[PDB]
């Protein structure tokens, strides 16, 4: 009665702060170029009378402008009013014809869901804090006490041109990839391995996967060339890697390309390109194009919408994994809670954590622990992380200082290899 | 910190009470017989340290035994642990080969979802009470302040054989159906009308729909014969009723029958028979069998699972309505909250409310108000209803006294028309 009435006021959104940040990144290679020296993100803080909630999203300027515009319309709403919040996000894009934020490797996701996602995450953080429960409980309760991640391998230069080598140094052949994988697994203990391909000819990447299978027997392996192959090349790669990889991710482009490959491939095909929005589900399912969908709450519309995708997957007999872009602790907490409370999210989740400096983040240290290749589900109310305001300002200052305004792997590569082509497929 | 720790204990399920009840029903006709003088339900009370939550489900003996068995396994869990609660329900049915609870008109729904549903409802009631918020807020917030229902018409005898006529008296022809509809709409103000068919030859039921269209111009009309027609008869009926009905519900049997009818029918086809479980979605969608799905949280697995169905419907371009069986106030509150927070649940919901005595229920009076053909969304924490313990005992005593142990429209009809056949299709 009096509890329900204060709860109505305690749950009203008074203010939203959107803060761009930048953190050091290494020269990781991929199908469209090479990572720039800084990765960008947006940090969303929803502020109520006496509390706040956090979300995290992309850092490019077009996206920040979209977030700010949505945020102006969301103020005054309850953190429980996710239906109307989503409507305001859609409304705010009404006149937006106005880039991925993901290097141009994930171009067809719903903009409204991308814009909605971090508000939805911050709202659930706030719903947890208000009720004194964890976000994983909001999502049906954890079915596992930690969430397993994969070791995400890249070919890479030894350092950014002109600077000294980073602590990993180069990986340009099977031997370098194995050495990277050992360093990473020795630190984290991941129990699954993924290699980012579309960088060398398929024959060479097949060789790195085989070299990894030999060096890490019985550890599930994945290969992701981000649609750098023709259908025939993809069929050849899948033949070579029969019995050797857990799944082959986005070998060829489009639902149609994937479906033609899936017909011959013995391993399941996974995707975060051909299926990246609810609208993509009907045609993919009709064509039996993909067998595993990598969820990503940052572009599927937040934690609850990701659960919906998970249920659609269970209903239609598809499997579910998790996609990552370079990210910080708010995203890691949300990925973990989501995965802990999603029964059929059984494959290990991708993360870029090993690529990020151990001392760069925006959350108070100590809430996110690794153990045996997994993050232990945070135990306090909400996401279980708090905002480190000194560290936010620091990473915001890096943002200001580095002058990067959008992610651009392709332009950065072309500064050193002006002949480089990012078009796919390529082999 | 200290709030989060008491919340962990305050949310643990200490006890579950399952109580069967019976309330007076009228001799409504349908494709499989005639309603018995009492309708059965189960009332579920989940009890925690200092609070309780309510759900409501079917009253047949096989179902009660299933609920009790699940309940024994659920005790000790948090009300937030809906994932593990669902698992326990599935586990509990492990050795259950061991009737619909719905007259044998809805026979293929998932038993695990039927068993899960009322615990899930009671848990959300409890999650709302604990957090001081309405269930509709738990489900993303209301997008409407009241939920519209339909006037649900039946052919019926004037009273049960041997007793005096009830206040409606008989409806056995177009004129009786119109008079029933006027009485009902004068009392409730519903703005949509549904007739239960499969009782008279299709020609006669077409005549009642036309007579209703004339007497209530511009009021959306629906017809539900519960698959009493052949495909050819269904095509004929849909031709006759072109432009006259909002949708034609379950004219023919099975996904295949529905699909063949949908090919020629100009109105959309609705269903609560051919699609009543998540497993039914893939084949229905493949065959384009149905255009509208009537949700029913009592057999689709509770409020959150119904939202999932709603999202699947939005993704695949299907519309969503709501199915009813004879029910009490706990179910009405849950149907209302669910519908208020589901953006694409735009058709008016079915209800049997007008068929129930105005003074029979199990909730404290006054929380559920009608206005303009809709229920005003309850405003307090949880479902917004409380248990009337004197009235529960009263309706439980009726249960004990009336000796009915399962719903059986067909056996009851055959007491008076031993020649009657419940097989479908029939015309
Ligand atoms: Mg990928
Ligand atoms: Mg029906």
């Amino acid at each position: 009665n009096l509890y329900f009435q204060s709860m109505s006021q305690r749950s009203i959104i008074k203010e939203i702060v959107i803060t761009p940040v930048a953190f050091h990144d290494m020269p990781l290679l991929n199908s469209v170029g090479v990572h720039e020296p800084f990765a960008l993100r947006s940090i969303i803080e929803i502020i109520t009378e006496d509390s706040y909630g956090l979300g995290e999203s992309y850092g490019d300027s077009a996206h920040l402008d979209r977030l700010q515009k949505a945020a102006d319309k969301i103020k005054g709403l309850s953190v429980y009013s996710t239906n109307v919040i989503y409507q305001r996000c859609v409304e705010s894009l009404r006149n937006d014809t106005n880039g991925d934020g993901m290097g141009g490797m994930v171009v067809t996701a719903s903009v409204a869901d991308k814009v909605f996602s971090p508000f939805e995450v911050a709202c659930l953080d706030l719903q947890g804090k208000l009720a004194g429960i964890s976000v994983s409980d909001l999502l049906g309760g954890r079915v596992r006490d930690s969430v397993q991640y994969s070791a995400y391998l890249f070919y890479k230069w030894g350092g950014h041109p002109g600077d000294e080598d980073d602590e990993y140094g180069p990986a340009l052949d099977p031997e370098g990839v194995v050495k990277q994988a050992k360093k990473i697994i020795d630190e984290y203990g991941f129990k699954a391995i993924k290699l980012k391909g579309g960088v060398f000819p398929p024959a060479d990447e097949v060789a790195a996967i085989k070299a990894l299978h030999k060096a890490f027997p019985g550890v599930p392996l994945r290969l992701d060339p981000n649609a750098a192959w023709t259908v025939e090349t993809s069929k050849w790669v899948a033949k070579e890697l029969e019995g050797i990889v857990e799944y082959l991710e986005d070998p060829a482009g489009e639902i149609e390309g994937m479906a033609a490959v899936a017909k011959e491939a013995s391993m399941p095909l996974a995707t975060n390109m051909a299926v990246v929005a609810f609208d993509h589900l009907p045609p993919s399912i009709l064509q039996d194009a993909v067998q595993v969908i990598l969820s990503d709450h940052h572009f599927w519309g937040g934690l609850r919408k990701s659960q919906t995708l998970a249920s659609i997957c269970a209903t239609w007999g598809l499997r579910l994994s998790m996609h990552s872009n370079s990210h910080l602790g708010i995203s890691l907490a949300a990925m973990t809670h989501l995965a802990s409370a999603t029964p059929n999210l059984d494959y290990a989740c991708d993360t870029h954590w090993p690529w990020k400096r151990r001392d760069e983040d925006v959350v108070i240290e100590g809430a996110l622990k690794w153990k045996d290749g997994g993050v232990i589900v945070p135990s306090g109310p909400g996401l279980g992380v708090e905002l480190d305001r000194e560290r936010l300002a620091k990473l915001h200052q890096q943002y200001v200082d580095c002058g990067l305004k959008k992610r651009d792997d392709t332009t950065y590569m072309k500064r050193f290899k002006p002949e480089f082509s990012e078009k796919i497929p390529r082999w």
Side-chain angles (χ1 to χ4, degrees), chain A residues 1-99 101-427:
Chain A
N1 178 16
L2 284 180
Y3 184 42
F4 161 86
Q5 205 41 92
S6 68
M7 264 301 166
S8 295
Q9 300 140 351
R10 294 189 59 234
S11 80
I12 295 306
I13 295 168
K14 300 289 185 193
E15 186 181 338
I16 303 175
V17 187
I18 307 180
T19 308
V21 292
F23 54 101
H24 289 275
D25 204 9
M26 308 186 190
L28 318 182
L29 295 168
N30 66 30
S31 62
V32 306
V34 63
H35 292 207
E36 300 162 279
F38 296 90
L40 316 179
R41 299 293 276 179
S42 50
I43 306 313
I44 287 69
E45 188 188 0
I46 290 184
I47 304 165
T48 59
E49 281 189 340
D50 62 25
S51 196
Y52 68 91
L54 299 177
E56 184 190 322
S57 189
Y58 307 105
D60 52 282
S61 280
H63 195 54
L64 299 168
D65 290 348
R66 284 174 174 128
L67 291 173
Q68 188 58 74
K69 210 164 294 189
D72 290 335
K73 299 167 88 91
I74 283 167
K75 181 166 86 194
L77 300 178
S78 184
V79 300
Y80 288 103
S81 304
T82 51
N83 284 316
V84 167
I85 293 172
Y86 179 73
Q87 266 159 32
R88 303 284 170 94
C89 290
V90 164
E91 280 164 36
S92 87
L93 291 160
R94 207 104 269 163
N95 304 130
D96 187 299
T97 164
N98 324 4
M102 295 174 272
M105 274 164 306
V106 182
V107 289
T108 58
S110 150
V111 175
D113 281 331
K114 288 207 224 178
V115 167
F116 181 59
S117 166
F119 305 111
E120 195 262 358
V121 174
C123 283
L124 294 183
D125 191 17
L126 273 160
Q127 293 174 29
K129 297 194 197 187
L130 292 170
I133 71 203
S134 192
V135 165
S136 55
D137 277 345
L138 289 174
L139 302 169
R142 71 199 186 273
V143 298
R144 46 190 69 95
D145 292 317
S146 67
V147 166
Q148 296 297 130
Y149 288 80
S150 70
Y152 207 161
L153 310 178
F154 291 71
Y155 295 109
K156 62 182 302 292
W157 296 338
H160 287 283
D163 312 319
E164 314 202 335
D165 275 27
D166 56 53
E167 79 177 72
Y168 286 90
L172 297 160
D173 52 31
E175 186 179 0
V177 175
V178 167
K179 181 171 181 249
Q180 191 186 94
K182 295 183 179 307
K183 175 176 166 59
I184 288 179
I185 303 228
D186 284 348
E187 184 172 4
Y188 288 90
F190 302 124
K191 292 174 198 156
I193 298 169
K194 185 188 174 175
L195 173 65
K196 170 71 36 195
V199 176
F200 292 96
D204 297 326
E205 304 192 335
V206 161
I209 294 299
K210 278 165 136 101
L212 284 165
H213 191 45
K214 287 263 295 169
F216 297 97
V219 173
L221 302 189
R222 318 152 166 175
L223 182 56
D224 184 6
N226 284 117
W229 311 321
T230 68
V231 164
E232 265 299 328
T233 284
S234 302
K235 289 171 169 174
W236 183 84
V237 166
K239 206 184 283 85
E240 293 290 286
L241 292 180
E242 184 164 11
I244 290 163
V245 293
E246 213 182 21
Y247 55 65
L248 191 53
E249 180 178 328
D250 288 315
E254 317 294 325
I255 284 169
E256 287 74 26
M258 294 290 279
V261 175
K263 280 188 176 73
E264 301 214 37
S266 61
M267 73 292 291
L269 301 184
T271 191
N272 61 255
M273 292 179 70
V275 181
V276 292
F278 289 93
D279 286 346
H280 300 161
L281 291 165
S284 179
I285 281 164
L286 187 61
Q287 290 183 51
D288 192 23
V290 319
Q291 289 71 57
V292 186
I293 298 167
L294 311 212
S295 67
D296 185 330
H297 74 267
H298 296 96
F299 65 75
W300 279 85
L303 307 192
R304 282 200 197 285
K305 291 241 208 170
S306 294
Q307 294 197 312
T308 299
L309 165 61
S311 296
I312 292 173
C313 288
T315 303
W316 266 272
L318 307 178
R319 306 190 205 193
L320 189 74
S321 182
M322 185 176 304
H323 166 266
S324 161
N325 288 107
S326 313
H327 64 92
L328 299 167
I330 292 164
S331 283
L332 181 72
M335 305 167 62
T336 298
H337 284 291
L338 165 67
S340 75
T342 299
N344 59 322
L345 204 172
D346 39 32
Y347 283 119
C349 296
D350 293 338
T351 181
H352 284 69
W353 211 252
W355 301 106
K356 171 181 78 53
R357 301 208 174 166
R358 306 179 171 91
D359 68 332
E360 291 187 324
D361 211 324
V362 301
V363 303
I364 296 304
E365 178 74 6
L368 297 167
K369 307 282 198 188
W370 292 88
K371 173 148 124 54
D372 246 286
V375 186
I376 295 166
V377 176
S379 52
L383 288 179
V385 290
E386 303 171 279
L387 192 55
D388 191 324
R389 309 205 174 249
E390 294 293 348
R391 298 218 274 173
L392 184 64
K394 227 129 135 39
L395 297 197
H396 178 62
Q397 181 93 68
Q398 288 215 125
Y399 174 78
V400 169
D401 178 40
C402 78
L404 286 191
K405 296 302 171 172
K406 59 178 308 195
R407 182 175 165 197
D408 202 341
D409 300 9
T410 305
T411 291
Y412 184 63
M413 173 62 92
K414 281 169 158 165
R415 282 185 44 193
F416 310 100
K417 289 171 185 166
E419 320 281 63
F420 175 83
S421 164
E422 81 281 6
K423 275 61 159 45
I424 59 175
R426 189 168 316 151
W427 298 279

